[PDB]
Amino acid sequence: RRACISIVEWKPFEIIILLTIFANCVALAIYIPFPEDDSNATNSNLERVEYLFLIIFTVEAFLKVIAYGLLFHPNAYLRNGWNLLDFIIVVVGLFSAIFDVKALRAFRVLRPLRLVSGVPSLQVVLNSIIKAMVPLLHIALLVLFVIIIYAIIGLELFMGKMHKTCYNQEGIADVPAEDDPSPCALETGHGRQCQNGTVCKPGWDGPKHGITNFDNFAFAM
């Protein structure tokens, strides 16, 4: 019985499944991600079409797991192949029930990787790229310490000193004076000082949205 399933793999149907990966790949680029829960007419069809691709891949896992053993099939490049199938079924199952339901769909962007796995003429070049990554770990290690050594130093010297920006002196509105806020250090300290008609009060407008300052250690890296 199981022999009947295995002999199917012999038949060159890898072309149709691979074209399904390519066909699906074209089904992801058309998906317009509207801002806030909106969805035009076409997006309604793709989700329906998404079910078909799910079935086509899901049956193959059964075809390729019974034929090649439950334990051995994961022990290959297909580990990600089953990785998509497992979590994609969760996405469709969980969405139909009704949070993080929408965000979980990101795993489907990994299907193109199956495309480079299917063709054996491209698996070699990818391994050529990866095989050259091992020596660069040392450079990565050095860059890791350069980040750490300099980030720690940045904390000590620039310990959240970018939180004083110039404010208008009239007092009608408490907003930064300059249209492009820049950190200021008031008198008694070295740095820039406001013009004739504004003052450097300790608010917070120096960095852009508080993302490019040395306040924390994560901000330092």
């Binding site: 509207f34 801002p35 806030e36 829960d37 909106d38 969805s39 035009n40």
Partner: protein, 97 residues
Amino acid sequence: IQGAASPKDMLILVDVSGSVSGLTLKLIRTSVSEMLETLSDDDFVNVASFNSNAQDVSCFQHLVQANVRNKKVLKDAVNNITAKGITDYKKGFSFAF
């Protein structure tokens, strides 16, 4: 405006849908307020909105003379709107008509 055109029966179909979140909504609100500013005190008006369901931004639910006061209510209601849901022109236009 008194001589340019005769009285009107306005009905502004604000499109508060997910696709208009951000700057587009600010432009929509400002334009609607300006439009209500360009209505005399002898023509009627209302402000609907469709987001897969055509509700009304205000408490009126019909045409309300676009008076000095009613304009203020419509302006406040328009200012306090948010983008959400899925656009549905068919239902919105049916509600409007």
